[PDB]
Amino acid sequence: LRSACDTVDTWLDDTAKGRQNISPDKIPWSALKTLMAQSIYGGRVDNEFDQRLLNTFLERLFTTRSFDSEFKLACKVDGHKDIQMPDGIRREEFVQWVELLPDTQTPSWLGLPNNAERVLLTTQGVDMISKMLKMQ
Amino acid sequence: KELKNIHVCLGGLFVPEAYITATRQYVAQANSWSLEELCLEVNVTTSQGATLDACSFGVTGLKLQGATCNNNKLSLSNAISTALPLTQLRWVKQTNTEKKASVVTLPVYLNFTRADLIFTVDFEIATKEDPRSFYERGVAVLCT
Structure with a gap:
């Protein structure tokens, strides 16, 4: 994450040469995506299908469309509702958006099927029973 | 010669990857081609025991995770594993026409841990x- 933050700052400063408002289409999306595809979060990947998955997220999230009003971070999490991109221009607006996220996270937030947590949740529930019983 | 006509459970084989290479090497030998010149086409049958072409091989026990196969057209599924009755692995001369904008390359792993890749299949989505x-x-x- 820190390396990705430095890369974002390095290339944004390179393009926006001391300016107040850089055009979204002038943001170096190719530089940011490739460096994260190959070096940052990419250097750990030793699997082509995991590499393709990493490329898929980077291609979806880092474009000029991310600055559109109706950008969609995730689609159809619960079948009907989905997560919208906040229309913020300042940091505090984004932090407010994060704090207003519901406590109803499902693996569909991650692009996974909602049944991915079924076995994992079931084991923990049995694990909680075993731990409670042991302390009795 | 009866080794070609027998259906194979890839899970049972000790080295399933080598079987994939052997079938690729078998077809290129008859047609005097190179292994790189053969792309793997995959056909899934409704039931086992179907007509086996000369350049085709029957594989049993493949399990589709997260999708269902219907008429060689994958659709997303909310089920965990869908059994593929009989998968025909057919080797054909490569025509390097890229993808088709509706084709997904699916990894084929040995078991649920997904720690070992065997080969890759191409399916058309619906x-x-x-x-x-x-x-x-x-x-x-x-x-x-």
């Missing part, structure tokens, strides 16, 4: 299913 959704949901094929 409806408006985004191929990227197949990538994000971890759609794959298991040998056992």
Whole structure:
């Protein structure tokens, strides 16, 4: 994450040469995506299908469309509702958006099927029973 | 010669990857081609015991994870594993015409741990299913 933050700052400063408002289409999306595809979060990947998955997220999230009003971070999490991109221009607006996220996270937030947590949740529930019983 | 006509459970084989290479080497030998010149076409049958072409091989026990196969057209599924009755692995001369904008390459792992890749299959998706959704949901094929 820190390396990705430095890369974002390095290339944004390179393009926006001391300016107040850089055009979204002038943001170096190719530089940011490739460096994260190959070096940052990419250097750990030793699997082509995991590499393709990493490329898929980077291609979806880092474009000029991310600055559109109706950008969609995730689609159809619960079948009907989905997560919208906040229309913020300042940091505090984004932090407010994060704090207003519901406590109803499902693996569909991650692009996974909602049944991915079924076995994992079931084991923990049995694990909680075993731990409670042991302390009795 | 009867080794070609017998259906094979890839999970049972000790080295399933070598069987994939052997079938690729078998077809290129008859047609005097190179192994790089053969691409793997996959056909899934409703029932086992179907007509086996000269350049085709029957494989049993493949399990589709996160999708269903219907008429060689994958659709996303909310089930965990879908059994593939009989998968025909057919080797054909490569024509390097790229993808088809509705084709997903699915990894075929040996078991549920997905620690060992055996080979890759190409399927055609159906409806408006985004191929990227197949990538994000971890759609794959298991040998056992």
